[PDB]
Amino acid sequence: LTACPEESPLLVGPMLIEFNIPVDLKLVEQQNPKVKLGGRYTPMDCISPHKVAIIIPFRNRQEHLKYWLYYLHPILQRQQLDYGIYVINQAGESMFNRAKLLNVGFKEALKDYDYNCFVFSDVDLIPMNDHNTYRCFSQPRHISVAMDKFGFSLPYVQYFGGVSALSKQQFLSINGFPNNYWGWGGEDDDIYNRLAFRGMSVSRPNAVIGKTRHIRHSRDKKNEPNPQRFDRIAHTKETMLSDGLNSLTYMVLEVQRYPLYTKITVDIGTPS
Amino acid sequence: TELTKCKVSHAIKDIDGYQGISLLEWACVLFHTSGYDTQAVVNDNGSTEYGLFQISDRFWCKSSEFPESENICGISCDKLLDDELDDDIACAKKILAIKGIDYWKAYKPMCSEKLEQWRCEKP
Ligand SMILES: O=c1ccn([C@@H]2O[C@H](COP(=O)(O)OP(=O)(O)O[C@H]3O[C@H](CO)[C@H](O)[C@H](O)[C@H]3O)[C@@H](O)[C@H]2O)c(=O)[nH]1
Numbered sequence: 001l002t003a004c005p006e007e008s009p010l011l012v013g014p015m016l017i018e019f020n021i022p023v024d025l026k027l028v029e030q031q032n033p034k035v036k037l038g039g040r041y042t043p044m045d046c047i048s049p050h051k052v053a054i055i056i057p058f059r060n061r062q063e064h065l066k067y068w069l070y071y072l073h074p075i076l077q078r079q080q081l082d083y084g085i086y087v088i089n090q091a092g093e094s095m096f097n098r099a100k101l102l103n104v105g106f107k108e109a110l111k112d113y114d115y116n117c118f119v120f121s122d123v124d125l126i127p128m129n130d131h132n133t134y135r136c137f138s139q140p141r142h143i144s145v146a147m148d149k150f151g152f153s154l155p156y157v158q159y160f161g162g163v164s165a166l167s168k169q170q171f172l173s174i175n176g177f178p179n180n181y182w183g184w185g186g187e188d189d190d191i192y193n194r195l196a197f198r199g200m201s202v203s204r205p206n207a208v209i210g211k212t213r214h215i216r217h218s219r220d221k222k223n224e225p226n227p228q229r230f231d232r233i234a235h236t237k238e239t240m241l242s243d244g245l246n247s248l249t250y251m252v253l254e255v256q257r258y259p260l261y262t263k264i265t266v267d268i269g270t271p272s
Numbered sequence: 273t274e275l276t277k278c279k280v281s282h283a284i285k286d287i288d289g290y291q292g293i294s295l296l297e298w299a300c301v302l303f304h305t306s307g308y309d310t311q312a313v314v315n316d317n318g319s320t321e322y323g324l325f326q327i328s329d330r331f332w333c334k335s336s337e338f339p340e341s342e343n344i345c346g347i348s349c350d351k352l353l354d355d356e357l358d359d360d361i362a363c364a365k366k367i368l369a370i371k372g373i374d375y376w377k378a379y380k381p382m383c384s385e386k387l388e389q390w391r392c393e394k395p
């Protein structure tokens with residue numbers, strides 16, 4: 001067999017994304033016979049150069065995950081990606097640390113496979129157009145560019161939240177993501193800063209191809225806006241050398257291989 | 273209510289240039305400060321910040337949680353949680369005159385460059 005085409009012939013373009021009918025992961029499995037244990041899929045038709053680990057920070061969002069899986073699995077297969085789904089579950093009830101969980105995902109996914117691309121995605125964002133490929137590009141890729149919760153318009157040009165993708169090399173280049181952002185906000189801006197300090201720009205699909213649906217939800221406990229976020233964002237230049245992949249520590253409490261994904265529950269410590 | 277950048281820019285026009293801060297800078301600061309939500313309520317701890325401008329009950333408005341507050345703006349913090357921004361603006365001006373733009377921590381890190389994207393072109 002030969003390399004997959006630059007653009008997938010299976011793409012359908014815009015899709016109707018709704019969270020009305022409840023999801024049955026069992027039906028989802030039935031509807032996705034080709035996904036292997038642990039949420040792994042590899043094209044049988046052609047050879048994909050995109051070995052993608054899709055990393056989702058998570059804690060008490062099982063209902064959102066169901067919808068995420070229901071929509072994304074069909075989409076990713078249509079995008080002809082050799083992918084694996086990873087849900088990094090934060091054990092305990094300390095402040096949520098999104099970026100640190102994303103770093104855990106990076107290291108843990110690499111134990112399973114020779115991934116060269118990492119997509120980091122909120123558990124509640126679903127792309128509305130399959131032309132918005134969940135893979136890596138020559139420059140860090142911001143994927144959820146047009147979120148319905150922001151009026152289908154990017155909130156600010158330096159915005160890197162929601163869904164993004166970094167090749168393995170781009171990720172290594174910035175010493176991964178920060179581990180010191182506890183609570184909501186700012187970590188995505190620190191990551192943006194890191195990428196910019198290493199001379200990279202942000203690649204993005206246009207706002208039509210990048211339309212994204214958000215699952216409206218009440219705010220979670222233990223993820224209140226971080227009071228130190230603005231002061232931290234202003235010092236990324238210096239803290240990125242000492243806070244990242246190179247200073248990451250955590251304990252794995254459990255690894256679950258389900259047919260639609262791998263869920264790693266980890267103890268990532270507390271604000272220090 | 274979650275306002276839009278232009279709704280905000282139109283609402284706070286009177287603050288343009290005050291203490292040297294432009295509308296573009298304010299549009300930027302307010303997005304990062306409260307996401308343009310007039311009902312935003314957030315803590316650091318022991319104190320709470322209200323509305324579009326995230327005016328704190330520590331020294332600026334009086335809240336039931338801290339009635340002893342200096343209440344420099346001379347106002348109930350609940351008046352900072354509605355869609356009438358005139359009193360929020362007068363309070364913000366006091367903060368600007370007394371403490372300065374540094375009260376808003378997002379300014380420096382988020383609003384020192386690429387200010388043009390914050391422009392409102394709607395008459
Ligand atoms: O209790 C929690 C808290 C967070 N999350 C995960 O963290 C993501 C983001 O948290 P929220 O949904 O509460 O925050 P926002 O919707 O306001 O998300 C935005 O702000 C975050 C700021 O910290 C990130 O930058 C994120 O990528 C961006 O889309 C969630 O989607 C989810 O994947 C959980 O699973 N459980």
Ligand SMILES: O=c1ccn([C@@H]2O[C@H](COP(=O)(O)OP(=O)(O)O)[C@@H](O)[C@H]2O)c(=O)[nH]1
Nearest residue numbers: 024025026029062063256258259260261263
């Ligand atoms: O690929 C999958 C993943 C999950 N499940 C179902 O989802 C349940 C819960 O999974 P998990 O432990 O991740 O959810 P949590 O208990 O943490 O809500 C399982 O027991 C199954 O009934 C399934 O059928 N297929």
Ligand SMILES: [Ca+2]
Nearest residue numbers: 122124214217
């Ligand atoms: Ca969300």
Ligand SMILES: [Ca+2]
Nearest residue numbers: 351352356357
């Ligand atoms: Ca008011």
